[model samples]
Structure formats: structure tokens, C-alpha cells
Target: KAKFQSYNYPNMYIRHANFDARIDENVTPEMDSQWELVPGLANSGDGYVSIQSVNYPGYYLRHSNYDLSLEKNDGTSLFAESATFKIVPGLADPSYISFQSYNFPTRYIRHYNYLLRLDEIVTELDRQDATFKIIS
Candidate 1:
């Protein structure tokens, strides 16, 4: 398990509350912010990876309807497809990372109003929003 810190907002960390993914400072039940970086469910190779909730065991972070959420592993094809991600070089900086949806290559994982989601990186700020750091 590891911690993900927002690149644009260095003080914030990724956390799940009510199964919703968001970036916030000082999250409650700190374990909600810990994630097990696992082998990608779709393709466990090189740049691909999956974010699993540390406390929830089989649950993983996935994007659906553009909103990022913590969902259970139901063993469905779509779950495997949507839960996997291609780890990309941070769109704004090489030292960080950006998650590209495995099934939706053009969309990048980002945050709007601190809520994690999938969005096209159309601006410099968008690139920053999509960037994150894995503090191992």
C-alpha cells in the first residue's frame, strides 16, 4: 500500500469517503487514503496498474460515468476493463504520474472541485490536476 499526493495541490491526498474518491487535506480514518497498488486487472504489465482500497480488500478505484469511485470487484468484464489503468508520465511533470483509463485512452484521471474524475487534459491546469505522486 502507498499514498497518493495531488501534484497540483501538494498538501492534499487522495481519499475515499462514502465510496467517493476525492482529494482533501487531513482525511479522517487515514486508512481511507491508503491504496494497494496492484497489478492491472486488464493487463498486468509495465505501465499498467490498479488502485485497490487497502481496508476494503477487493474493492478498487475505478472511473464510471466520468466520476471516480471505490467499487467492489464483481468479477465482471467491465469491472476488469474499467478498473485497470495505464500509468502515464505526469502530463505536467515527468517526476509524477497521471492515470489513463485502460479502456478510454484519451481520458486522464483528474479532479474537479477536489472530486476525482476522468477528463481530457485541455489546459495546463488540467494537466496539473491530472498529476499525482506515489509516496511509497
Candidate 2:
């Protein structure tokens, strides 16, 4: 298990609240930010990985309509594709990491207004928001 800490906001970590994904300064359970980087369901290859909730098995962090949320696995092709992401070097800091949408390589998972969403990183702010540290 690992915690996904926001690069731009070191004190914040990604968590699911009411099924919606966001970066919060403090997660009540703390475990909510813990995730296991599992083999990608869409493609089990290098650079591909899936974000699974460490505290809730069978739940995956997936993006739909560009909005990120924690949804239960339905074992569908669409679910797998949406749940999978390609691990890439951080846009702001190469030592950190970023998650690129498997189905939309041009899009990345980023936090905007504290909420996680999928969008293309086109600015320095976007790069910082997309970068994260996987604290083990």
C-alpha cells in the first residue's frame, strides 16, 4: 500500500469522499489515501498500472466523463479501460510521477480546485497538479 501525495500540496493526499476523488489536507481514515498499484486490467505491460483502494478491495479509482471517482469493479471492458492508467514521469518533477489515462493518452489525472479530473497538462499549474509522490 502507498499514499498518493500531491506534489504541489505536500500535505494533501488523494482520497475518495462520497465516491468522488480529491486531494485533501487530511483524510479522516487516512487509509482512504492508501492504494495498491496493481497490474493493469486493460493492459498488463510496462508503464501500465491500476489504482486499487487498499482499504476497499474490488474498488478502483477510475475516471468517467473526465471526473475521477472510486467505483466498484463490474468486470466490464469499459471499467478496465477507465480504471487503468499509464505511469509516467511527473510533468513538474521527474522524480515524482503522473498518471496518464489509458484510453486517452493525451489526458492526465490532475487535481483542480482539489478535485481530481482528467485533462491535458498544458501549463505549469497543470504540470504541478498532475505530479504526485507515491509514498510507500
Residues 39-130 of candidate 2: C-alpha lDDT, one tens digit per residue: 99899999899999988899999999999999999999999999999999998999999999999999999999799999988999999999
Candidate 1 accuracy as lDDT = 0.91
Q: Give the root-mean-square deviation of each candidate in angstroms.
A: 0.8, 0.6
Candidate 1 local lDDT, 1-136, one digit each (tens): 7888999899889999999999999888989999998999989898899999998999999889999999999988899889999988999898899999999999988988789999888999999999999988
Best by TM-score: 2
Question: Clash number for every model?
Answer: 0, 0
- Counting only residues 3 or more apart in sequence or on different chains, how many pairs clash (N, Cα, C under 3 Å) in candidate 2? 0
TM-score for each predicted model, relative to the true structure: 0.97, 0.98
lDDT of 1 at 50: 91
* Model 1 Cα shift for residue 28 (angstroms): 0.9
Tell me the deviation in Å of residue 28 in model 2.
0.6
| 87 Cα displacement, candidate 1 (Å) | 0.8
Ten residues in sequence with the least summed lDDT for candidate 2: 25-34
TM-score for candidate 1, residues paired by index: 0.97
